[PDB]
Design a protein around this ligand. Structure first.
Ligand SMILES: O=C(Nc1ccn2nc(-c3ccccc3)nc2c1)c1ccnc(Cl)c1Cl
Ligand SMILES: [Mg+2]
Ligand SMILES: [Zn+2]
Length: 313
């Protein structure tokens, strides 16, 4: 009850900033998450013992892949913490509860392969879930862990509040399927520009939470340049293994996934900043002005990739 988590001074101050890197000490990541739940939600949101047991089972169900791993989960939850803390009054009690949990869980049991690779491989999961294949699995794994004995962190909610928080988590996780982001942001852009955006409309809130999930999921591009650049190595290590596995099925992979085309990575990053990242943080900043530091950090990293192409590094 009277037991706060506290962090060393440098982490206590920097965890509040959008560009915080959670560091290489894995054993500190559970504590960092509990700290963020306690400040974002309250010390009463969750029974400490249940929350701790839930975090450790979630950790166990992330795999030892280069990028879609336990560090990505906590990193994405920290970006959500920074958004929620900078927008104190815009979100409900259930949303604050559900969204950090959704982010910790959003890539549960990821194997390092895209929805496309599962479909070309003819993986069983692609027959069980014809679209958003991995994201429906991630939500399935979240419910499994919530149902383990002593793991029900939502046990004090009413039946209808419990159904609402699991619906927030389901939509939040499904929204991390980047195939769905393009149309979600176009609708949000039109709604904001014609002045029809209404945060009392549930279908509108759902869309805005979707865009927050995309923004937290991509937050590698909003870090200081040396974090962004070193993280890109882990991203491509997965993509190039997927490309190798495409070649094993007798399919030329897209260039993004072909390690024989490393030289085109800088141009490929420009496309991604211009087609996905910048538009994402731009629309987010229009809807939630205090998230502007994400757009600014993203623009700084776009300018660093432009320098790589100009051979200035
Ligand atoms: O890097 C990412 N995406 C992208 C998206 C398109 N292309 N095309 C290329 C490319 C094309 C031709 C030749 C060589 C490379 N490289 C990419 C990387 C990414 C994905 C998911 N999460 C995050 Cl934070 C990021 Cl930063
Ligand atoms: Mg994912
Ligand atoms: Zn992710």
């Amino acid at each position: 009850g009277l037991m706060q988590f506290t962090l060393p001074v440098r982490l206590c101050k920097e965890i509040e900033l959008f560009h915080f890197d959670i560091g290489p000490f894995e054993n500190m990541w559970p504590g960092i998450f509990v700290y963020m739940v306690h400040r974002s939600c309250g010390t009463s949101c969750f029974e400490l013992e249940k929350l701790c047991r839930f975090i450790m089972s979630v950790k166990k169900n992330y795999r030892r892949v280069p990028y879609h791993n336990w560090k990505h989960a906590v990193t994405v939850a920290h970006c959500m913490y920074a958004i929620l803390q900078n927008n104190h009054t815009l979100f409900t009690d259930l949303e604050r509860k559900g969204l950090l949990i959704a982010c910790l869980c959003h890539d549960l049991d990821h194997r390092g392969f895209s929805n496309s690779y599962l479909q070309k491989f003819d993986h069983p999961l692609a027959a069980l879930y014809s679209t958003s294949t991995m994201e429906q699995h991630h939500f399935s794994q979240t419910v499994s862990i919530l149902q383990l004995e002593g793991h029900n962190i939502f046990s004090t909610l009413s039946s209808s509040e419990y159904e609402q928080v699991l619906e927030i988590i389901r939509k939040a996780i499904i929204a991390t399927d980047l195939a769905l982001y393009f149309g979600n942001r176009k609708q949000l852009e039109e709604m904001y520009q014609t002045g029809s955006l209404n945060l009392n409309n549930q279908s509108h809130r759902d869309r805005v939470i979707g865009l927050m999930m995309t923004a937290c999921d991509l937050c590698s591009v909003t870090k200081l340049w040396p974090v962004t650049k070193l993280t890109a190595n882990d991203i491509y290590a997965e993509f190039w293994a997927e490309g190798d596995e495409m070649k094993k099925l007798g399919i030329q992979p897209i260039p993004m996934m072909d390690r024989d085309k490393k030289d085109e990575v800088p141009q490929g990053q420009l496309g991604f900043y211009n087609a996905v990242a910048i538009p994402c943080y731009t629309t987010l900043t229009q809807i939630l002005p205090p998230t502007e530091p994400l757009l600014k950090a993203c623009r700084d990293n776009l300018s660093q990739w432009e320098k790589v192409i100009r051979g200035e590094e």
